[PDB]
A = this chain, B = another copy of it.
Amino acid sequence: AEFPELCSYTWEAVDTKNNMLYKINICGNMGVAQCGPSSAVCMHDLKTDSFHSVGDSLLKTASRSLLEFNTTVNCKQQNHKIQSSITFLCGKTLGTPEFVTATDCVHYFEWRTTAACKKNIFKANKEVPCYAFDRELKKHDLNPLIKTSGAYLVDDSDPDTSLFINVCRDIEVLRASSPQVRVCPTGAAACLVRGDRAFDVGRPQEGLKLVSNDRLVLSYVKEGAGQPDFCDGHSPAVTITFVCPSERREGTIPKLTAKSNCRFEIEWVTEYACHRDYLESRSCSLSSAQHDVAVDLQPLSRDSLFYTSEADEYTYYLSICGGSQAPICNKKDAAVCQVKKADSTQVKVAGRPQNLTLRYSDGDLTLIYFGGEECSSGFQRMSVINFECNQTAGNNGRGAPVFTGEVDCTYFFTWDTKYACV
């Protein structure tokens, strides 16, 4: 199959400027009758409450990073039939098909996903859709929480048991630092370690479900034989409910609210359950109105016109928010530029200024730049600036970025500044 792991589900996308909600299924077997058996992309006009298929699975044209779906229906313009186009970019999670734009004749989408990576190293054993659109077509996206490595420890307050869980995907046990996680059965999404016994009590199956128009639920299942003796004829199950706080607050730890008959119920209060637009901006500022917090990083773009974070093998030049770049990078458009220390000529864009995301969630302020140059795996380089509040920092308050490490073409920095004070 083409990007097989994506074919197991019917993915949703949306156009808010036009109140349209798209149903996407790369393999067409989405079964939405009102859209045709082989519809790969089914558009649902909300106002006229109708279903119009704009892409048929049997009329597919595929390339490395591009999927085109033609139809038989012709557009208003003669010799033109309706179609859908999806650009695939390598990602670190299964991600989501992002609506980019449509025209009378063609509907365009972009999809950063593990499925579209050359080096299949970025694939999880099993990952399910990790987001949901609400009644007002707003996206509640939990992708930022999915760990490509490690897991989270749930607070059960037990002394005899430990419980780890990953989000929308299996915990990567194979190469995990913590030797406590390495004992978990491969493919487990929820891992119960009781008295050095490590049991698998949940694997991802269905996608993220919006339940109360607000809350989100993810259910791991462990049906079948081999049920641990202490479950007493019951099959293990983990049900995580994510709730969006009425007001901003420090991130918390997913809490265990019930654990009888190996039927674990977990509650995770995280602002990642709130609509994306509440947590993010495409500029260097956030407001109380939209974000419930006001931040303006613009002043960090005022001794050269660029910040330079030194590294063992490379030099990172971070011109933030329109700030200008270092002369050694004034040859390419980039926000985070990487130069090889043993080769003043090997330069790499690890973040484009047009691809920026200012996010604030659970107490952490992050500035992300992406769409960087591709790494052999396919992943376009990306840089994440972890902002911390510090009223008293060098540079009349401002500060400077500190390259704190790279992880498979994603570069991490820390930036203590007063402008990061909520």
The minimal Cβ–Cβ distance linking A312 to chain B, given in whole angstroms, is 11
- CB contacts (< 8 Å) of A345 on chain B: these are 373
A376 touches B342 (CB 8 A): yes
**Quick one: which of A315-374 are within 8 Å of B by CB?**
340, 342-343, 345-346, 373-374
A374 touches B343 (CB 8 A): yes
A376 touches B118 (CB 8 A): no
B118 touches A373 (CB 8 A): no
A313 at the interface (CB under 8 A from B): yes
B313 touches A343 (CB 8 A): no
- CB contacts (< 8 Å) of A342 on chain B: these are 118, 374, 376
Kindly state the separation between the CA atoms of A376 and B342 in the bound complex, as whole angstroms.
6
Give chain A's interface residue range (CB within 8 Å of chain B).
10 to 19
Instruction: Name the 8 nearest CB pairs between A and B, nearest first.
Output: A342-B376, A342-B374, A343-B374, A343-B373, A343-B376, A118-B342, A346-B346, A313-B376
Kindly state the separation between the CA atoms of A313 and B375 in the bound complex, as whole angstroms.
12
- CB contacts (< 8 Å) of A340 on chain B: these are 376
Closest to A118 in B: B342
Write 10 A-B pairs (CB below 8 A) sorted by A numbering: A118-B342, A313-B376, A340-B376, A342-B374, A342-B376, A343-B373, A343-B374, A343-B376, A345-B373, A346-B346
Chain A residues with a Cβ under 8 A of chain B: 118, 313, 340, 342-343, 345-346, 373-374, 376
Kindly state the separation between the CA atoms of A182 and B373 in the bound complex, as whole angstroms.
41
Kindly state the separation between the CA atoms of A215 and B319 in the bound complex, as whole angstroms.
65
Known: A340-B376, A343-B374, A346-B346. 7 other contacts (CB 8 A): A118-B342, A313-B376, A342-B374, A342-B376, A343-B373, A343-B376, A345-B373
- CB contacts (< 8 Å) of A373 on chain B: these are 343, 345
The minimal Cβ–Cβ distance linking A51 to chain B, given in whole angstroms, is 40
- CB contacts (< 8 Å) of A346 on chain B: these are 346
Kindly state the separation between the CA atoms of A73 and B120 in the bound complex, as whole angstroms.
68
Kindly state the separation between the CA atoms of A373 and B340 in the bound complex, as whole angstroms.
13
Closest to A313 in B: B376
The minimal Cβ–Cβ distance linking A128 to chain B, given in whole angstroms, is 30
Closest to A340 in B: B376
Kindly state the separation between the CA atoms of A145 and B346 in the bound complex, as whole angstroms.
34
Closest to A346 in B: B346
Kindly state the separation between the CA atoms of A343 and B343 in the bound complex, as whole angstroms.
17
Kindly state the separation between the CA atoms of A313 and B342 in the bound complex, as whole angstroms.
21
The minimal Cβ–Cβ distance linking A289 to chain B, given in whole angstroms, is 43
Closest to A373 in B: B343
Closest to A376 in B: B342
Closest to A374 in B: B342
Closest to A345 in B: B373
- CB contacts (< 8 Å) of A343 on chain B: these are 373-374, 376
Closest to A341 in B: B376
- CB contacts (< 8 Å) of A118 on chain B: these are 342
The minimal Cβ–Cβ distance linking A179 to chain B, given in whole angstroms, is 30
Kindly state the separation between the CA atoms of A345 and B373 in the bound complex, as whole angstroms.
10
Closest to A347 in B: B345
